[PDB]
């Protein structure tokens, strides 16, 4: 499979999550995703084919993971936006007020702005601290997916939000949305990963 940010993958033939970003760790290919998507050694599949396994994760507290892929996988510096792509150029952290888009297998590509940083989410499992909030909408299934500026700067991976009974927060005004992502920079230094850029 061609690894693109925002595409669906399954965990142990049950849950679905979305790919965050292609990364490497020395000669190992991988992708960053959300921690709550799977446990260590869970098998990830893309299109019914095994692509790799969860190598590490932290959830709750933080919400981060990376899946080490087999060498058959093709890592690409891109995030899906409909049939088009956004190229990943680096990971400069944008500030509050900055515009940001996110990509995932349920709501697709959605944009909004960063409204707050260092938010705590109190999920059933425990609190996850230090999340950034934006008001781009998102749905169940979008977890793990890319948050990126149109300029190509990778921001982080989808954690969660104030999802309504229809499964997303797209049907409530932007003013009332709270979609939270885990910052990419701490995930990259914690696991010694380097972002694939183009």
């Amino acid at each position: 499979a061609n690894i693109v940010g925002g595409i669906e993958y399954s965990i142990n033939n049950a849950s679905l999550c979305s790919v965050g970003f292609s990364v490497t760790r020395g000669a190992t290919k991988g992708f960053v995703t959300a921690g709550h998507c799977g446990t260590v050694n869970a098998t990830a599949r893309i299109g019914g084919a095994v692509v790799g396994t969860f190598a590490a994760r932290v959830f709750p507290g933080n919400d981060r993971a990376w899946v080490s892929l087999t060498s058959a996988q093709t890592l690409l510096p891109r995030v899906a936006n409909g049939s088009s792509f956004v190229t990943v150029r680096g990971s400069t952290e944008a500030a509050v007020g900055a515009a940001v888009c996110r990509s995932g297998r349920t709501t697709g590509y959605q944009c909004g702005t960063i409204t707050a940083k260092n938010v705590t989410a109190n999920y059933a499992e425990g609190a996850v601290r230090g999340l950034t909030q934006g008001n781009a909408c998102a749905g169940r299934g979008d977890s793990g997916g890319s948050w990126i500026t149109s300029a190509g700067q990778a921001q982080g991976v989808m954690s969660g939000g104030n999802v309504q009974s229809n499964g997303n927060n797209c049907g409530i005004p932007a003013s009332q949305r709270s979609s939270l992502f885990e910052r990419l920079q701490p995930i990259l230094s914690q696991y010694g990963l380097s972002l694939v850029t183009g």
Partner: peptide
Amino acid sequence: AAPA
């Protein structure tokens, strides 16, 4: 807020 919930995971996703």
